[PDB]
Amino acid sequence: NCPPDFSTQFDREKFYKKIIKTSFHEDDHIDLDIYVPGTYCFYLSFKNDKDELETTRKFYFVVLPIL
Amino acid sequence: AHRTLLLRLSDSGEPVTSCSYGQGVLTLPSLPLPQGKKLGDMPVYTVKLAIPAGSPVTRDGLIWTNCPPDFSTQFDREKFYKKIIKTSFHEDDHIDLDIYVPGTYCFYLSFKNDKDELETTRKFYFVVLPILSVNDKFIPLNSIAMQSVVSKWMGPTIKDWEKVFARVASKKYNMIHFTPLQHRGESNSPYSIYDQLEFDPTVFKSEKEVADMVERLRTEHNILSLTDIVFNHTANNSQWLLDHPEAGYNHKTSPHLISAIELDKKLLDFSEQMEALGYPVDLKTVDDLIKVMDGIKEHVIGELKLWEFYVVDVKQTVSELREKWGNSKSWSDDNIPSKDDSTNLAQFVRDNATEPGFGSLGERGSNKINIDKFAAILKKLHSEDYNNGIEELATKILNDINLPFYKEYDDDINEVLEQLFNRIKYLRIDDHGPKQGPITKKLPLSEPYFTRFKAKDGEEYALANNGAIWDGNPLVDFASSQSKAYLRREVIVWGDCVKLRYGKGPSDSPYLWERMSKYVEMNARIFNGFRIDNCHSTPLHVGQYFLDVARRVNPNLYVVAELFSGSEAMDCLFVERLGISSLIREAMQAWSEEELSRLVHRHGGRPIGSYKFVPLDDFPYPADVKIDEEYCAYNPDDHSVKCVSEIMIPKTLTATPPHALFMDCTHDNETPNQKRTVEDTLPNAALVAFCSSAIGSVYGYDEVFPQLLDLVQEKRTYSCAENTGISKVKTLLNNMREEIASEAVDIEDSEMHVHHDGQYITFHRTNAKNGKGWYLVARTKFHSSGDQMLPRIKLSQTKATFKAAFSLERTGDAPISDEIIEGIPTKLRELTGFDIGFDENTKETSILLPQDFPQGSIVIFETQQLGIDDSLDHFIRSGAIKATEKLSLESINYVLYRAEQEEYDYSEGRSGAYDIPDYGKPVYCGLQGWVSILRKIIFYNDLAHPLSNNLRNGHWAVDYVVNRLDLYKDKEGVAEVQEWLRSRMERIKQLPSYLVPSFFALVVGIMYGCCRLRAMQLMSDNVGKSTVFVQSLAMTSIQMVSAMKSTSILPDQNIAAMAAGLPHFSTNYMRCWGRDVFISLRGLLLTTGRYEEAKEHILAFAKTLKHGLIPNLLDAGRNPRYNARDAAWFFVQAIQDYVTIVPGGVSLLQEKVTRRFPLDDEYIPYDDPKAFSYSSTIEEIIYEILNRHAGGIKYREANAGPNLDRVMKDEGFNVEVNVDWETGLIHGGSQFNCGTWMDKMGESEKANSVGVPGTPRDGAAVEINGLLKSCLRFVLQLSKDGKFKYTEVTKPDGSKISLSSWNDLLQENFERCFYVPKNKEDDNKFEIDATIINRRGIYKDLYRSGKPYEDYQFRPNFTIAMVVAPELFTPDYAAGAIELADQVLRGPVGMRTLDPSDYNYRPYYNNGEDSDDFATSKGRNYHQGPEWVWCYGYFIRAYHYFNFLTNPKCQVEGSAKKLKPSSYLYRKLYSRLLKHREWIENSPWAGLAELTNKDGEVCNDSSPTQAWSTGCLLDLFYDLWISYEE
């Protein structure tokens, strides 16, 4: 639910897509640019071993305010 | 030199067909290499792929192709190479595919889908034909004469063969087809090959022995050679079949045929004991067959176990149910059907408790039930104890399961014996096959379906033999599991041969692929090509692999194939992927004379006078293109493919029908003696030789053999009797084709006419380049059907010359030798008496046949069309570029366009547009009117079109093209263009009438292409390098800018004046409109580069300033009309656009005009000397508008009355404008006013709308204030640079306000007044009365309108302010507001003028309405619903701008870290212009309409081409170019 840029407001339930670059050798790095302090979470969707869709937990991280 | 072809692609990556030649293949023309060049010195051909700009394929697009990158790299079918597509929104991308070796090549495109996924198009193939030379002389593919000879009938020695070679060499054949010269099998049939890797031991012993013989044929008699190649079968007695029995389908490899094996060996076992346990061993009664069938009823059918191959063993399942009753048991599914639903319960068990491969065939009891799963259902359905009625229930279910299998069995058995007693009859009882010998071991009752042998591995096998199903699909392998033909006995077999089981590749049959590979490349080293019998039965992947192995050995492999697949499409697909160069067509298949004439018509050529292809208004004309300035950069030794004209747009690659090899008689069809008579051999072979294709014949056809030679049994040898039958005539026919082959090249270069009258068939072969031709009259002898007299043959504008004539007569029967095949004695009598009359006045040739012209005779005439020489094509394809050298962007308008009203202006109403009978007039008087009609005519070769009829009925349209330019002769470059048309049209009139249409369209198309290229050269780079769509939009600038006689933009002179639209806004006072001119000025003049012409319009309108306003109707400079509030601010915006774009554009500010009206608003002093009076500068004019509006204007329209406006009310003439200085907005207008672009005054006397404005836009208009803010921002930065002096502004009282304060006033109050906030909680900071509102999140259409409900109406005018003054809008508010307009107000081509949710929505505009409806009557709906195209331009310009600021997905990181629009934004932009590109493509007028009804519905009253409709779309392309593509 991290907004893509500073112009976009924050919404708890509007999540944005990010593509994981699959490789058997190289790990993939995906940046989450944060422009405003607040509560942000992320979860991962993937293709199950049953060819179905599966989802992980929501993992949160807090950006503290600037006083 | 230049061997390049242009292959334009569509938006989906598919090749574009330039002409309609029918179902075909992208074949490249067979041409010799340049002088002294071998394979590898240079590319044979270069295919230029053209990808449209902005197409969905360009998005991360890649061009794939299996073409090797250079000559050193070998060809691989599945190794494709990368090619990068250079994406652009303006410029198309060209990618070259260099080809160094003939063969089969394909290409497909991968791109990024709209789902951000990867997507791929089809594979598109194109064939490069082989290069056939004999010694050092090139052999054109359509001049091949192939003589098919059978090896075993030429003698047992090599010299016995070279005697036959000398005979066919005297007949002047240039190619010999060999039945396979390999060791033959048991039956000695040439196609049942014993050993593939060694030639016939009778004649040859090594490869060098046969290779020397073929090379001897090349050097001695100048004859190339090719053989049959057999892929489908091999002989039934090959020593390698014992070592490798898996090469065919057997009980191991193809287990489904096990049922068919035990039935075949049930007949070899039966046919030998037939007489013992039977009676009719060999009789000829119908009842005699029935007792054999009754013997079949009990001895084979009854002894084959009721066939458990289909039926589940019932009692052997119950036996195995009690056996395992008590193991894996119990079920739980509650979907098990009840025992009442017997049918559904059976199919439930069919899907759950079955072993793999249920229903399909295999071993005897292959179909069986899974017991542990079956009993688990029985315990869940009935009971867990077995004796509780399970034996009854389990058997009842299995019996119901076998019901479809039993009915599948009765339908199979019936076809087994019905095929038997229908084949045994014809086989035995002589109906048409005399062979009722007593059934022996050699000739049993059953034809051998399987070849039995014991292999070297020890085990016994049973391979079968292929054949052909009667009317079955040849693409289905009848030996595979998909067919049941070997079981149901639906196969006509060849006992000589045996299966060849290829799999999905070499993995399924390793030794078979390795052997056939070495067998293919062995003949490829020796011979020049192959011949494939029944190519349709060979699988594609099988034929593809081995033909590519052959081409790696012999790069010039010539492939012939007897291809009769399901349809022409399947025939083309096989030719595409396999690389077939010629298809076999048989002339003996024609049952009657009409069928022969239709066969000859298919392979004869194109109609006489067929249209020639030319680039027209559907091509890009790059200003930076190479040119043959006089069509002279060609050398015959280079052997280069020629461009269409002086413009070097290369020859287009389009699908053409696959080449044909017309055989007058093959080695499988009956002799003319059998099917027809012997005399027909002469006229049949003549009609075949006249076809524009390759021809061939079997040995004995020319030597009139009595009957078809049995390829299996016969052992006699060809006779040494020389020069028998047609041998003399074939020497003439082949020698004549050698003279024609030297110059005839492409499909447009050979034309034909064929006529059939009774037993006569007429053939007229014509070369379209020089006019040389042949005429053949052949009287056919299908039967002796009495005397028939042919009418007088008449040829127009042609002279005829007698060439030769012959008759073939029979002199008894043929000798009966047992050692030598001798033909029928025939006389070849030369004929005379053909009278050739030539009328020296009408230039008409008449031909009368002599009464002594018996059936089986021919007569050949040499003919030459009058007026055509070899130098005609060069004269037409040259000089047009030099003729357009002095053309200007104004003068091109008179050559290409001019509406009929525009032409009436120059001709005082005498000329106009050429009326085409039974059609109408072209849309323009110039060439564009012709090209718009001719493009579809040339594409379909519609020689029956009314224009095509009129062009050959007389020279009216020919002279009309030249005589028009007398009106505009004095203009720049028009005189030299007329002289080129005069000289070319004069030469055309000397041609035959039937050839005028094709040449008329060629001359007009060439000059059109030169005029269109000259336009792109005179324009700017962004236009002269872009797609067809952008250039087509730019050509509209020439449609509107023209000099006239009844009007202009200056009152003293007649110069170029931009018309509002054609044809209803082009003459007198209706042409120039100040509002229309300056909305289109940036697109049509600045984007294109007409800087000087744009200045003239700004200066001319500046002379007629009054009330601080620009007049809507400009009467050249005299008595105008100032009924417009928009014009002055669109005019001042065009000045800003000029200064911004034109280099040194600030010079316009100090240009002095002569204001034709005194500063104080005076009267109409046109003749009063106070008109000229004083001069005004553009800088002063800009300030005069700003200060007059500010100080408050006050005027009533001068010369008021019905003479001015016959419907406007008295209070309507006093219109005014004033600035509310508390907000900074410019207000003005009344409910009797039309001072905006929505100018529609009612005129209905029945609906009482007379004088009632349909859209009175009184008050502050968004466009006016948006342009005001743009003008203020312009003059502020202008004063900062020292180009504008004024900063003071006077108020009606006397106060002064600085221009910056007025600029800040709008910046602080504009959005506050117009924006309707989406939140009701903010309905207090944006001046909103919530009682009257439609939607929120909308920028208002007006402020302080007379009727307040129109303030909150969603209209497309708010985008004009968004484009010219983007600072007035917060990004998030504007982005959501324009997203609503995209969903609601955006039509397909035009912009909806009013929200459909409003009650005044009248989307259909009909100016001619005599109803009582207050709106629709007399067309007051003009701006209340209808979709206008120019607002679409301002819409998408701001749709692109504000989506680039708001949506982060519409932005992407760029070079120099300057953010460029993402492909996601270009994709959304490109989609919203497809309907515009379709419109200008499929419109007779080469532009965009003014208005459109609801949802793309064509409005008849709308002007079909409007200046500001196309000009606002050019504004979008210039925005994207000047900001991102520099």
Ligand SMILES: OC[C@H]1O[C@H](O[C@H]2[C@H](O)[C@@H](O)[C@@H](O[C@H]3[C@H](O)[C@@H](O)[C@@H](O[C@H]4[C@H](O)[C@@H](O)[C@@H](O[C@H]5[C@H](O)[C@@H](O)[C@@H](O)O[C@@H]5CO)O[C@@H]4CO)O[C@@H]3CO)O[C@@H]2CO)[C@H](O)[C@@H](O)[C@@H]1O
């Ligand atoms: O020769 C001198 C000329 O002087 C005067 O001209 C005046 C007009 O007579 C007068 O009507 C007005 O012009 C207005 C008109 O009142 C206003 O309603 C509007 O007209 C619309 C049409 O309503 C609309 O249908 C459309 O007309 C097109 C039509 O769609 C198209 O298919 C084809 O038929 O051509 C038609 C036009 O000819 O568009 C027009 C234009 O928007 O706007 C007109 C222009 O403001 O004022 C004129 C002032 O000079 C005399 O009255 C006239 O008799 C004299 O001949």
Ligand SMILES: OC[C@H]1O[C@H](O[C@H]2[C@H](O)[C@@H](O)[C@@H](O)O[C@@H]2CO)[C@H](O)[C@@H](O)[C@@H]1O
């Ligand atoms: O307000 C909801 C209402 O809108 C429509 O009525 C229009 C009316 O026809 C126009 O004159 C406009 O200016 O005032 C209203 C704006 O909404 C319809 O009644 C319907 O769409 C809806 O109920």
